[PDB]
Amino acid sequence: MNISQFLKSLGLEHLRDIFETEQITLRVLADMGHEELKEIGINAYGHRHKLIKGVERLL
Amino acid sequence: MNISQFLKSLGLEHLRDIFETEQITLRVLADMGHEELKEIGINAYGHRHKLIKGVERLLGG
Amino acid sequence: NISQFLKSLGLEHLRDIFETEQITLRVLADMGHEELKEIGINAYGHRHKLIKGVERLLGG
Amino acid sequence: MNISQFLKSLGLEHLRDIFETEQITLRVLADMGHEELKEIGINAYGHRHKLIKGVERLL
């Protein structure tokens, strides 16, 4: 629901600072792919994969 | 339409001073991408994304 | 929106050219005299009103 | 009497869009202090000072 709650559900709460600094809401995240997520500092494929598939589960 | 109403609609009124100092009109904003917006001090991806998509919705059908 | 735009310039008769050519306000903003001649706006006066209209509307 | 004419007289015409978007009339501006003006985005003390003192004369 909130981006903090979304990350917690994927076990990715430790990524919270990137999302806060870049002002990424769960709605902004919905329009983001691998290239956009690499741009904001999500360097691990596994993390981007979890985020992309996580938004797909909802959206 | 004007920038002040445009920013308010996206909930980005706090960016009003950057737009005023840089004399950014909707015409200028329409040709701006992520690199151009970073140049004027819009450092958050989320803010640039909202601006870019906002102009797309505004000037599209 | 583009229909509202044309109406404001008294150019409502150009609605069909704009619809057929899929010209939105974003497309119109990047168009000059040569591009407008290409879609069939043959009168200078009409192209001038469109170009200056987008300039006034967008800031700008 | 027109907020646009008032702003012009103080050399603060650049502030017109904030006043229009926030629907601030001279009557509204008359009950506004430094805290209320900061709230609508008048971030410079000098600008708030000119506005407050400007309305004080218009009485």
Added chain:
Amino acid sequence: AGLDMNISQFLKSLGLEHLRDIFETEQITLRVLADMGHEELKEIGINAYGHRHKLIKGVERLLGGQ
């Protein structure tokens, strides 16, 4: 407190009659409006500071002041 007044008449008196639909949809009476500040009014869609200011000061004058 005597604020049993018609919200339609209240808005008209402030020159804010155009807000009639927000107040009707949200079922805002004068008694509800009396406990509302800038944050609560922003929440129901009253986005202009000037409009919220007029409403808050309008209820104050109807209540005596502050």
Added chain:
Amino acid sequence: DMNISQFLKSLGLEHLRDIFETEQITLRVLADMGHEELKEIGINAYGHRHKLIKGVERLLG
């Protein structure tokens, strides 16, 4: 790499002629100028700096 007066006219920035004359900005000086350097000589609008930078880029290439 001609007279600066012709360059500004081509971009519709002829009103900037006095800044360029007073600051003794030639096209070769302008070619090494970015957004920070142009802000320093009084070009406060992003749109004007953008037009100047991109204008010299086209001239060079």
